C-alpha cells in the first residue's frame, strides 16, 4: 500500500474535511475575529480569521507557524484597510511580501482590490512609493515581477519591503510542483537577503519571533497563499518529518478551515511531500 496511493489520500481527505467542517464560522463565532462598528473586516463573509493569531484587530490576517516556519497569511486588503496594512508591513520589518493575486483580478474594479504595491500613493499618515526591479520566469509561462515598497511616515523610521508579485496565477488553480518549488525558493532567498540586511544593522526585530515574517496573500489568502506556504514549510530542513496532515491542520487551526482550498492545490503539496519521502498521515 503506497503511502501516497488512493487509499491513503482517501484517508487524508476524510480527516481534513471533518476538520474543515468543524472550523466553519458560526454567527459571532468566538474563535474568529469580528468586525467592529460598521467598517467591513472580511472580504468574503465566509473566509474568517482566527482571533487567537490575529495580527491586527482591524485586518483579516494571521500569524502562522507550521513546524518551525513563521509567516503571515492575509486577505487582499480592502481600501479602508490600507493604512493599517502598511502599518503591519512596517512593524514586521517585512523581509518579503508575496502577492499571488493576478493582474486581471487587480485590474477588475468590481473586485475592490486596490493596486497598492505598483503605484505610489498616500494613505492617511503613511505615503508609499513603488519601484519595479526584476522579473523572473518561474516556469510554465508563470512570471514573477518584483518591486520595492518604501513606507514612510512622520516620526517613524522609513522601511523598505521587497515585493514579489506572481501576476499570472489564476484563482482556484494550482501551479505545478516545479513552479511551486521554484517560487518557494524565490521567496526564501528574497526573505534571506533582507533579513541579513537587518541583522547586519543590529535590528532588534531580529530577536522577536513575531517579526521578520514573510507576508503572503492572494485574494482571499487561503488557496494560492496556502499552497505556497506549504511549500516554504517543506523546503526548510528543520521541519523534518512533519506530515502533510500536520501541515494542513496547523494552517487550518491558525487562520480558518478553508486554508488549502482546492483539491488540486492539495495534490501539489502531496507531490512535493512524496518527492521528499515526507509522510502523508500521522501515526
mmCIF file of C-alpha atoms in Angstrom:
data_model
loop_
_atom_site.group_PDB
_atom_site.id
_atom_site.type_symbol
_atom_site.label_atom_id
_atom_site.label_comp_id
_atom_site.label_asym_id
_atom_site.label_seq_id
_atom_site.Cartn_x
_atom_site.Cartn_y
_atom_site.Cartn_z
ATOM 1 C CA UNK A 1 0.000 0.000 0.000
ATOM 2 C CA UNK A 2 1.869 3.047 -1.248
ATOM 3 C CA UNK A 3 1.783 5.717 1.401
ATOM 4 C CA UNK A 4 0.776 8.014 -1.491
ATOM 5 C CA UNK A 5 -1.951 5.885 -3.113
ATOM 6 C CA UNK A 6 -5.760 6.450 -3.479
ATOM 7 C CA UNK A 7 -6.493 4.800 -0.149
ATOM 8 C CA UNK A 8 -4.092 6.895 1.923
ATOM 9 C CA UNK A 9 -5.114 10.017 0.114
ATOM 10 C CA UNK A 10 -8.692 8.908 0.746
ATOM 11 C CA UNK A 11 -7.919 8.932 4.452
ATOM 12 C CA UNK A 12 -6.108 12.298 4.380
ATOM 13 C CA UNK A 13 -9.194 13.862 2.795
ATOM 14 C CA UNK A 14 -11.522 12.243 5.229
ATOM 15 C CA UNK A 15 -9.633 13.843 8.073
ATOM 16 C CA UNK A 16 -9.170 17.257 6.560
ATOM 17 C CA UNK A 17 -12.863 17.548 5.601
ATOM 18 C CA UNK A 18 -14.004 16.735 9.085
ATOM 19 C CA UNK A 19 -11.644 19.459 10.271
ATOM 20 C CA UNK A 20 -12.841 21.988 7.723
ATOM 21 C CA UNK A 21 -16.434 21.409 8.678
ATOM 22 C CA UNK A 22 -15.657 21.809 12.381
ATOM 23 C CA UNK A 23 -13.919 25.133 11.766
ATOM 24 C CA UNK A 24 -16.818 26.685 9.776
ATOM 25 C CA UNK A 25 -17.617 30.030 11.330
ATOM 26 C CA UNK A 26 -20.760 30.406 13.399
ATOM 27 C CA UNK A 27 -22.518 33.716 13.839
ATOM 28 C CA UNK A 28 -20.413 35.890 16.125
ATOM 29 C CA UNK A 29 -18.225 32.761 16.479
ATOM 30 C CA UNK A 30 -15.852 33.475 19.422
ATOM 31 C CA UNK A 31 -12.999 31.632 17.677
ATOM 32 C CA UNK A 32 -12.980 34.254 14.890
ATOM 33 C CA UNK A 33 -12.272 37.987 14.708
ATOM 34 C CA UNK A 34 -15.467 40.121 14.485
ATOM 35 C CA UNK A 35 -15.998 43.434 12.634
ATOM 36 C CA UNK A 36 -16.111 46.425 14.989
ATOM 37 C CA UNK A 37 -18.828 49.030 14.476
ATOM 38 C CA UNK A 38 -19.601 49.096 10.778
ATOM 39 C CA UNK A 39 -16.356 49.094 8.811
ATOM 40 C CA UNK A 40 -16.195 45.812 6.962
ATOM 41 C CA UNK A 41 -13.432 43.473 8.165
ATOM 42 C CA UNK A 42 -13.851 40.477 5.910
ATOM 43 C CA UNK A 43 -13.558 40.353 2.111
ATOM 44 C CA UNK A 44 -15.807 37.219 1.950
ATOM 45 C CA UNK A 45 -18.098 36.706 4.913
ATOM 46 C CA UNK A 46 -17.339 33.004 4.963
ATOM 47 C CA UNK A 47 -13.469 33.312 4.926
ATOM 48 C CA UNK A 48 -12.751 34.268 8.504
ATOM 49 C CA UNK A 49 -9.695 34.999 10.694
ATOM 50 C CA UNK A 50 -8.812 33.087 13.963
ATOM 51 C CA UNK A 51 -8.927 35.692 16.871
ATOM 52 C CA UNK A 52 -6.034 33.882 18.637
ATOM 53 C CA UNK A 53 -3.438 34.510 15.942
ATOM 54 C CA UNK A 54 -4.859 37.777 14.732
ATOM 55 C CA UNK A 55 -2.047 40.115 13.735
ATOM 56 C CA UNK A 56 -4.230 43.298 13.961
ATOM 57 C CA UNK A 57 -7.758 43.862 15.382
ATOM 58 C CA UNK A 58 -8.832 45.517 12.145
ATOM 59 C CA UNK A 59 -7.341 43.245 9.494
ATOM 60 C CA UNK A 60 -8.070 39.671 8.292
ATOM 61 C CA UNK A 61 -4.565 38.464 8.816
ATOM 62 C CA UNK A 62 -2.927 35.646 10.779
ATOM 63 C CA UNK A 63 0.459 34.685 12.310
ATOM 64 C CA UNK A 64 1.047 31.145 11.074
ATOM 65 C CA UNK A 65 3.651 28.545 12.093
ATOM 66 C CA UNK A 66 3.885 25.081 10.588
ATOM 67 C CA UNK A 67 6.683 23.196 12.275
ATOM 68 C CA UNK A 68 9.379 25.868 12.587
ATOM 69 C CA UNK A 69 8.246 28.053 9.688
ATOM 70 C CA UNK A 70 6.841 31.501 10.658
ATOM 71 C CA UNK A 71 4.868 33.656 8.118
ATOM 72 C CA UNK A 72 1.775 35.945 7.999
ATOM 73 C CA UNK A 73 -1.109 34.978 5.694
ATOM 74 C CA UNK A 74 -3.758 37.565 4.866
ATOM 75 C CA UNK A 75 -6.634 38.652 2.644
ATOM 76 C CA UNK A 76 -6.153 41.272 -0.067
ATOM 77 C CA UNK A 77 -6.663 44.464 1.994
ATOM 78 C CA UNK A 78 -9.796 46.490 1.309
ATOM 79 C CA UNK A 79 -9.471 50.213 0.611
ATOM 80 C CA UNK A 80 -10.338 51.208 4.194
ATOM 81 C CA UNK A 81 -7.722 48.733 5.445
ATOM 82 C CA UNK A 82 -4.691 50.037 3.502
ATOM 83 C CA UNK A 83 -3.104 52.258 6.101
ATOM 84 C CA UNK A 84 -3.221 49.532 8.763
ATOM 85 C CA UNK A 85 -1.855 47.098 6.191
ATOM 86 C CA UNK A 86 1.229 49.170 5.536
ATOM 87 C CA UNK A 87 1.466 49.592 9.309
ATOM 88 C CA UNK A 88 1.605 45.836 9.772
ATOM 89 C CA UNK A 89 4.058 45.582 6.876
ATOM 90 C CA UNK A 90 6.441 48.057 8.507
ATOM 91 C CA UNK A 91 6.343 46.891 12.091
ATOM 92 C CA UNK A 92 7.003 43.390 10.856
ATOM 93 C CA UNK A 93 10.142 44.657 9.098
ATOM 94 C CA UNK A 94 8.763 42.528 6.330
ATOM 95 C CA UNK A 95 11.541 40.518 4.755
ATOM 96 C CA UNK A 96 9.304 39.819 1.747
ATOM 97 C CA UNK A 97 5.727 40.449 0.604
ATOM 98 C CA UNK A 98 4.451 37.755 -1.771
ATOM 99 C CA UNK A 99 1.255 38.751 -3.657
ATOM 100 C CA UNK A 100 -0.393 35.943 -5.639
ATOM 101 C CA UNK A 101 -3.475 37.743 -6.882
ATOM 102 C CA UNK A 102 -3.339 38.158 -10.737
ATOM 103 C CA UNK A 103 -3.175 41.468 -12.630
ATOM 104 C CA UNK A 104 -6.557 40.768 -14.147
ATOM 105 C CA UNK A 105 -8.146 40.435 -10.695
ATOM 106 C CA UNK A 106 -6.406 43.596 -9.540
ATOM 107 C CA UNK A 107 -7.396 45.378 -12.773
ATOM 108 C CA UNK A 108 -11.047 44.463 -12.360
ATOM 109 C CA UNK A 109 -12.717 47.258 -10.419
ATOM 110 C CA UNK A 110 -15.669 45.031 -9.273
ATOM 111 C CA UNK A 111 -13.222 43.069 -7.121
ATOM 112 C CA UNK A 112 -12.308 46.066 -4.992
ATOM 113 C CA UNK A 113 -8.633 45.090 -4.995
ATOM 114 C CA UNK A 114 -6.657 48.346 -4.727
ATOM 115 C CA UNK A 115 -3.417 48.354 -6.693
ATOM 116 C CA UNK A 116 -1.371 49.220 -3.666
ATOM 117 C CA UNK A 117 2.129 47.941 -4.430
ATOM 118 C CA UNK A 118 2.651 49.079 -8.085
ATOM 119 C CA UNK A 119 1.939 52.778 -7.699
ATOM 120 C CA UNK A 120 2.933 55.464 -5.265
ATOM 121 C CA UNK A 121 0.322 56.967 -3.016
ATOM 122 C CA UNK A 122 -0.620 58.482 0.341
ATOM 123 C CA UNK A 123 -2.765 56.667 2.921
ATOM 124 C CA UNK A 124 -3.531 58.704 5.991
ATOM 125 C CA UNK A 125 -0.221 59.416 7.732
ATOM 126 C CA UNK A 126 1.713 56.954 5.538
ATOM 127 C CA UNK A 127 2.946 57.690 1.975
ATOM 128 C CA UNK A 128 4.267 54.985 -0.320
ATOM 129 C CA UNK A 129 6.373 54.646 -3.406
ATOM 130 C CA UNK A 130 6.852 51.607 -5.576
ATOM 131 C CA UNK A 131 9.732 50.778 -7.896
ATOM 132 C CA UNK A 132 9.837 47.810 -10.233
ATOM 133 C CA UNK A 133 13.177 45.967 -10.237
ATOM 134 C CA UNK A 134 13.236 42.487 -11.712
ATOM 135 C CA UNK A 135 11.075 39.943 -13.422
ATOM 136 C CA UNK A 136 11.757 36.223 -13.054
ATOM 137 C CA UNK A 137 10.426 33.277 -15.070
ATOM 138 C CA UNK A 138 9.268 30.591 -12.708
ATOM 139 C CA UNK A 139 8.390 28.120 -15.409
ATOM 140 C CA UNK A 140 5.248 27.238 -17.317
ATOM 141 C CA UNK A 141 4.703 30.739 -18.513
ATOM 142 C CA UNK A 142 4.287 31.867 -14.843
ATOM 143 C CA UNK A 143 6.100 35.149 -14.181
ATOM 144 C CA UNK A 144 7.100 36.996 -11.013
ATOM 145 C CA UNK A 145 7.566 40.764 -11.078
ATOM 146 C CA UNK A 146 9.391 42.352 -8.174
ATOM 147 C CA UNK A 147 9.057 45.784 -6.669
ATOM 148 C CA UNK A 148 10.493 47.612 -3.694
ATOM 149 C CA UNK A 149 7.959 49.373 -1.470
ATOM 150 C CA UNK A 150 9.399 52.272 0.630
ATOM 151 C CA UNK A 151 6.972 53.042 3.508
ATOM 152 C CA UNK A 152 7.500 56.479 5.152
ATOM 153 C CA UNK A 153 5.548 58.110 7.981
ATOM 154 C CA UNK A 154 6.427 61.145 10.070
ATOM 155 C CA UNK A 155 8.124 60.314 13.349
ATOM 156 C CA UNK A 156 8.743 56.774 12.175
ATOM 157 C CA UNK A 157 11.790 55.229 10.668
ATOM 158 C CA UNK A 158 11.487 54.504 6.977
ATOM 159 C CA UNK A 159 11.054 50.896 5.973
ATOM 160 C CA UNK A 160 11.588 49.187 2.630
ATOM 161 C CA UNK A 161 9.852 45.918 1.859
ATOM 162 C CA UNK A 162 10.668 43.843 -1.175
ATOM 163 C CA UNK A 163 7.586 42.645 -3.138
ATOM 164 C CA UNK A 164 7.322 39.522 -5.382
ATOM 165 C CA UNK A 165 4.169 39.623 -7.486
ATOM 166 C CA UNK A 166 3.173 36.431 -9.409
ATOM 167 C CA UNK A 167 0.948 38.246 -11.842
ATOM 168 C CA UNK A 168 -0.479 35.232 -13.721
ATOM 169 C CA UNK A 169 -1.562 32.567 -11.319
ATOM 170 C CA UNK A 170 -5.332 32.109 -11.640
ATOM 171 C CA UNK A 171 -7.624 31.790 -8.736
ATOM 172 C CA UNK A 172 -8.836 28.251 -7.902
ATOM 173 C CA UNK A 173 -5.928 26.764 -9.853
ATOM 174 C CA UNK A 174 -2.707 25.025 -8.701
ATOM 175 C CA UNK A 175 0.617 25.727 -10.407
ATOM 176 C CA UNK A 176 2.812 22.681 -10.906
ATOM 177 C CA UNK A 177 5.156 21.170 -8.250
ATOM 178 C CA UNK A 178 8.104 22.630 -10.189
ATOM 179 C CA UNK A 179 6.822 26.153 -10.497
ATOM 180 C CA UNK A 180 5.765 25.872 -6.864
ATOM 181 C CA UNK A 181 9.214 24.716 -5.743
ATOM 182 C CA UNK A 182 10.691 27.497 -7.838
ATOM 183 C CA UNK A 183 8.515 30.223 -6.324
ATOM 184 C CA UNK A 184 9.154 28.999 -2.710
ATOM 185 C CA UNK A 185 12.909 29.240 -3.372
ATOM 186 C CA UNK A 186 12.411 32.702 -4.808
ATOM 187 C CA UNK A 187 10.542 33.803 -1.705
ATOM 188 C CA UNK A 188 13.047 32.271 0.758
ATOM 189 C CA UNK A 189 16.036 33.860 -0.933
ATOM 190 C CA UNK A 190 14.356 37.261 -1.057
ATOM 191 C CA UNK A 191 13.454 36.995 2.632
ATOM 192 C CA UNK A 192 17.001 35.872 3.463
ATOM 193 C CA UNK A 193 18.721 38.810 1.860
ATOM 194 C CA UNK A 194 16.519 41.367 3.559
ATOM 195 C CA UNK A 195 16.796 39.573 6.928
ATOM 196 C CA UNK A 196 20.590 39.554 6.629
ATOM 197 C CA UNK A 197 20.465 43.303 5.977
ATOM 198 C CA UNK A 198 18.522 43.877 9.275
ATOM 199 C CA UNK A 199 20.850 41.561 11.041
ATOM 200 C CA UNK A 200 23.991 43.347 9.798
ATOM 201 C CA UNK A 201 22.383 46.505 11.133
ATOM 202 C CA UNK A 202 21.644 45.034 14.513
ATOM 203 C CA UNK A 203 17.876 45.361 14.156
ATOM 204 C CA UNK A 204 16.195 44.325 17.360
ATOM 205 C CA UNK A 205 13.406 42.895 15.208
ATOM 206 C CA UNK A 206 15.879 40.159 14.542
ATOM 207 C CA UNK A 207 15.234 38.693 18.010
ATOM 208 C CA UNK A 208 11.447 38.947 18.026
ATOM 209 C CA UNK A 209 9.645 35.890 16.565
ATOM 210 C CA UNK A 210 6.524 37.913 15.947
ATOM 211 C CA UNK A 211 8.509 39.963 13.423
ATOM 212 C CA UNK A 212 10.634 39.372 10.282
ATOM 213 C CA UNK A 213 7.963 37.060 8.931
ATOM 214 C CA UNK A 214 7.268 36.755 5.159
ATOM 215 C CA UNK A 215 3.717 38.160 4.389
ATOM 216 C CA UNK A 216 1.777 36.216 1.730
ATOM 217 C CA UNK A 217 -1.648 36.883 0.183
ATOM 218 C CA UNK A 218 -3.662 36.084 -2.846
ATOM 219 C CA UNK A 219 -7.243 37.435 -2.858
ATOM 220 C CA UNK A 220 -8.791 35.552 -0.006
ATOM 221 C CA UNK A 221 -5.500 34.294 1.474
ATOM 222 C CA UNK A 222 -6.477 30.591 1.661
ATOM 223 C CA UNK A 223 -5.875 28.946 -1.702
ATOM 224 C CA UNK A 224 -2.910 30.202 -3.687
ATOM 225 C CA UNK A 225 -1.471 31.573 -0.354
ATOM 226 C CA UNK A 226 -1.833 28.232 1.438
ATOM 227 C CA UNK A 227 -0.226 26.238 -1.416
ATOM 228 C CA UNK A 228 2.892 28.444 -1.394
ATOM 229 C CA UNK A 229 3.066 28.388 2.411
ATOM 230 C CA UNK A 230 3.015 24.598 2.466
ATOM 231 C CA UNK A 231 5.867 24.699 0.015
ATOM 232 C CA UNK A 232 8.068 27.036 2.139
ATOM 233 C CA UNK A 233 7.354 24.764 5.048
ATOM 234 C CA UNK A 234 8.694 21.830 3.013
ATOM 235 C CA UNK A 235 11.999 23.400 1.963
ATOM 236 C CA UNK A 236 13.021 24.300 5.490
ATOM 237 C CA UNK A 237 15.108 21.308 6.757
ATOM 238 C CA UNK A 238 14.075 21.930 10.371
ATOM 239 C CA UNK A 239 10.580 20.682 9.507
ATOM 240 C CA UNK A 240 11.882 17.215 9.057
ATOM 241 C CA UNK A 241 9.201 14.557 9.401
ATOM 242 C CA UNK A 242 6.293 16.935 9.683
ATOM 243 C CA UNK A 243 3.476 15.237 7.687
ATOM 244 C CA UNK A 244 1.087 16.770 5.155
ATOM 245 C CA UNK A 245 -1.687 16.055 7.703
ATOM 246 C CA UNK A 246 0.015 18.243 10.357
ATOM 247 C CA UNK A 247 0.961 20.914 7.833
ATOM 248 C CA UNK A 248 -2.630 21.419 6.857
ATOM 249 C CA UNK A 249 -4.161 21.080 10.347
ATOM 250 C CA UNK A 250 -1.819 23.831 11.682
ATOM 251 C CA UNK A 251 -2.714 26.194 8.848
ATOM 252 C CA UNK A 252 -6.462 25.480 9.340
ATOM 253 C CA UNK A 253 -6.252 25.857 13.064
ATOM 254 C CA UNK A 254 -4.351 29.172 12.825
ATOM 255 C CA UNK A 255 -6.458 31.020 10.185
ATOM 256 C CA UNK A 256 -9.578 29.121 9.038
ATOM 257 C CA UNK A 257 -10.767 25.758 7.785
ATOM 258 C CA UNK A 258 -10.530 26.706 4.159
ATOM 259 C CA UNK A 259 -6.684 27.006 4.113
ATOM 260 C CA UNK A 260 -5.626 24.794 1.162
ATOM 261 C CA UNK A 261 -8.847 25.382 -0.673
ATOM 262 C CA UNK A 262 -8.982 23.279 -3.863
ATOM 263 C CA UNK A 263 -8.216 19.612 -4.099
ATOM 264 C CA UNK A 264 -5.645 20.179 -6.833
ATOM 265 C CA UNK A 265 -3.671 22.516 -4.593
ATOM 266 C CA UNK A 266 -3.502 19.684 -2.012
ATOM 267 C CA UNK A 267 -2.166 17.410 -4.792
ATOM 268 C CA UNK A 268 0.792 19.722 -5.394
ATOM 269 C CA UNK A 269 1.683 19.604 -1.686
ATOM 270 C CA UNK A 270 1.351 15.807 -1.761
ATOM 271 C CA UNK A 271 3.728 15.553 -4.773
ATOM 272 C CA UNK A 272 6.421 17.531 -3.072
ATOM 273 C CA UNK A 273 5.922 15.524 0.157
ATOM 274 C CA UNK A 274 6.324 12.400 -1.916
ATOM 275 C CA UNK A 275 9.392 13.610 -3.638
ATOM 276 C CA UNK A 276 10.765 14.046 -0.135
ATOM 277 C CA UNK A 277 9.640 10.797 1.398
ATOM 278 C CA UNK A 278 7.606 13.003 3.776
ATOM 279 C CA UNK A 279 4.633 11.142 5.377
ATOM 280 C CA UNK A 280 1.070 11.956 4.319
ATOM 281 C CA UNK A 281 -0.684 10.776 7.586
ATOM 282 C CA UNK A 282 0.190 10.976 11.311
ATOM 283 C CA UNK A 283 0.773 7.693 13.269
#
